[PDB]
Amino acid sequence: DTHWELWKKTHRKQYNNKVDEISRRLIWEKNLKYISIHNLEASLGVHTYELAMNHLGDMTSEEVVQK
Amino acid sequence: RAPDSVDYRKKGYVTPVKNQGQCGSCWAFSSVGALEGQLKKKTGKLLNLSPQNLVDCVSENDGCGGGYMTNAFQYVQKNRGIDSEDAYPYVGQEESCMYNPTGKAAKCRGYREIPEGNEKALKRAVARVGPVSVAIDASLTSFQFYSKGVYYDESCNSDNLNHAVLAVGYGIQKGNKHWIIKNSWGENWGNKGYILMARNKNNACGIANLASFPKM
Ligand SMILES: *C(=N)N(CC(=O)N(C)Cc1ccccc1)NC(=O)OC(C)(C)C
Ligand SMILES: [Mg+2]
């Protein structure tokens, strides 16, 4: 997909094989969906803050601060 | 009257946002940021101190495997100095302690700990001393993708400290009190590498649970 390719190129992402890349693409798709919902909720006064996709889009929140 | 607000970025106490990368050196970035603030306050000069010096040389910490800001300050003291970024650059992986006294940019005569969970004491420290090293729960997706506004997530665990950052001030936005927090995940995270974290919301993310600063 054009967006996934541009994301990987921009953040210089590399994967070890097709399974690893698809598994990381799946986490990224789930994070995009999370961001969209939270921001909708923020537009309705549910949150005092908003979110955006960044270089950590293909990781779990736990992975970011663990291993 | 004027609001009770502080932002040390406006006084040139704060260096630009760094990127720790794929290394668990958040504590080293937090430590140098606190040291940078005090060096500016003492000598009037603002320069990048070496996180890599702390990663490669603080034996009581684990370089890319985590550590404490207090242990970093104690090393700088016992070592009678820390080098600049220029004399000891960041490579984002631990190596052997190539500390060089010729590149010394700062010293430390001890450190201070804010009383556990006391946000008012943290506030007074930031107001009177300058940037203060703090630890938080950074483990939520809400933090991972933070972009703008005042970060307040009730799921955030103050008994689960896993990340070190720098409190460079405090204020209020849209009636929400905040801490001005400098992160070490580069300028592509947050608001150009910064996050506003909720202030006086029952010690949200443990912001005042493990807060410390160097004496210079
Ligand atoms: C920050 N870079 N950092 C290290 C890290 O993320 N590790 C090693 C994972 C981890 C940290 C804390 C608890 C469990 C796992 N964080 C860090 O050093 O955190 C403190 C709380 C300052 C030790
Ligand atoms: Mg999560």
Numbering used by the authors:
A (entry chain P): 8 to 74
B (entry chain A): 0 to 215
Original authors' sentences:
Cathepsin K (CatK) is one of the most investigated cysteine cathepsins, both by academia and pharmaceutical companies. It is expressed in high levels in osteoclasts, where it serves as the principal protease involved in bone remodelling. Cathepsin K (CatK) is a target for the treatment of osteoporosis, arthritis, and bone metastasis. Peptidomimetics with a cyanohydrazide warhead represent a new class of highly potent CatK inhibitors; however, their binding mechanism is unknown.
The obtained iCatK comprised two non-covalently bound domains (chains), namely the residual propeptide domain (Glu5p to Ser83p) and the main domain (Ser87p to Met215), including the C-terminal part of the propeptide and mCatK. The model of the iCatK-Gü2602 complex contained residues Asp8p to Lys74p and Arg99p to Met215. The propeptide segment that blocks the active site in pCatK (downstream of the α3p helix) is proteolytically removed or flexible in iCatK, and therefore the active site cleft of iCatK becomes accessible for inhibitors. However, the residual propeptide domain partially occludes the primed region of the active site, in particular the S1’ subsite of iCatK is occupied. In general, Gü2602 binds to the S1 and S2 subsites of iCatK in a manner that is similar to what has been shown for the Gü2602-mCatK complex, with a r.m.s.d. of 1.23 Å; this value is substantially increased compared to Gü1303 in its complexes, with a r.m.s.d. of 0.19 Å. The major conformational change, however, is in the benzyl group of the P1 N-benzyl-N-methylacetamide substructure. It is rotated towards the residual propeptide domain of iCatK and forms new contacts with its Val72p and Gln73p residues (Figure 5(A,B), Table S2). The terminal Boc group accommodates the S2 pocket of iCatK analogously as in mCatK. The network of hydrogen bonds is identical, and the pattern of nonpolar interactions (Tyr67, Asn161, and Ala163 in iCatK) is similar for both Gü2602 complexes. iCatK was demonstrated to bind Gü2602 and Gü1303 in an analogous manner to that observed in the mCatK complexes. This indicated that the iCatK active site is competent to bind inhibitory ligands in the available subsites and can be regulated by them.
